[PDB]
């Protein structure tokens, strides 16, 4: 149905069995998403901080 696919499609083993792939132009991995640390209320610990 198509000729060539240019999209972030994950190169897997089960997709290699049906079609081919090029070399990975963009390498990546699994990361950790957390919020930016805003100023939290220190409270009672401030007396002996």
């Amino acid at each position: 149905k198509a000729d060539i696919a240019i999209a972030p499609l994950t190169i897997t083993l089960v997709r290699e069995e049906v079609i081919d792939f090029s070399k990975p132009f963009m390498s990546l991995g699994i990361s950790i998403m957390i919020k930016k640390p805003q100023k939290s209320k220190p409270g009672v610990f401030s007396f002996l901080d």
Binding site: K41, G43, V44, F45
Partner: protein
């Protein structure tokens, strides 16, 4: 003598009235999402004229405990109950003063009630986080008048103790 006792009585009455006015409404004011007044129970915005209980304590454990103390303003209510009990004890010790030792306990309870009122005022000031309502100033002035009335009451008590020590000798 009796004029100082009547001044102490009307000072306790004015302090209880200003404490009731501080409990009632207009304790704090802050611009919400126009301005809005608050009296530690509900908020009233500037539609216009409606009022709603905006005293929602939920949206370390010390922050949750401070929110629980700030929930429904338990400490100034206990301070007002202790001030009412001290005023009743002063009214009971004013007429038919048979025992010469209940006045010191009533004055100690009155000063401890003022200290608890100051602690609750510190809690309600810490619960705020731009101006402030009239009832905060009224509660502060009632704390000043209550401290002055406690000084006058313990001055009358030490004068009565000196009179008793002079009559016993």
């Amino acid at each position: 003598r009796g004029v100082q006792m009547l001044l102490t009585t009307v000072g306790a009455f004015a302090a209880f009235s200003l404490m009731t006015i501080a409990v009632g409404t207009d304790y704090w004011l802050y611009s919400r999402g126009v301005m809005t007044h608050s009296g530690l129970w509900r908020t009233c915005c500037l539609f216009k004229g409606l009022c709603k209980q905006i005293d929602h304590f939920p949206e370390d454990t010390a922050e949750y405990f401070l929110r629980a103390v700030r929930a429904s303003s338990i400490f100034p209510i206990l301070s007002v109950i202790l001030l009412f009990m001290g005023g009743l004890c002063i009214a009971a010790s004013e007429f038919y003063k048979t025992r010469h030792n209940i006045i010191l306990s009533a004055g100690i309870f009155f000063v401890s009630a003022g200290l608890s009122n100051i602690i609750g005022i510190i809690v309600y000031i810490s619960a705020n986080a731009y101006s402030y309502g009239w009832s905060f100033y009224f509660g502060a002035l009632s704390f000043i008048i209550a401290e002055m009335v406690g000084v006058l009451a313990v001055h009358m008590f030490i004068d009565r103790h000196k009179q008793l020590r002079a009559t016993a000798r």
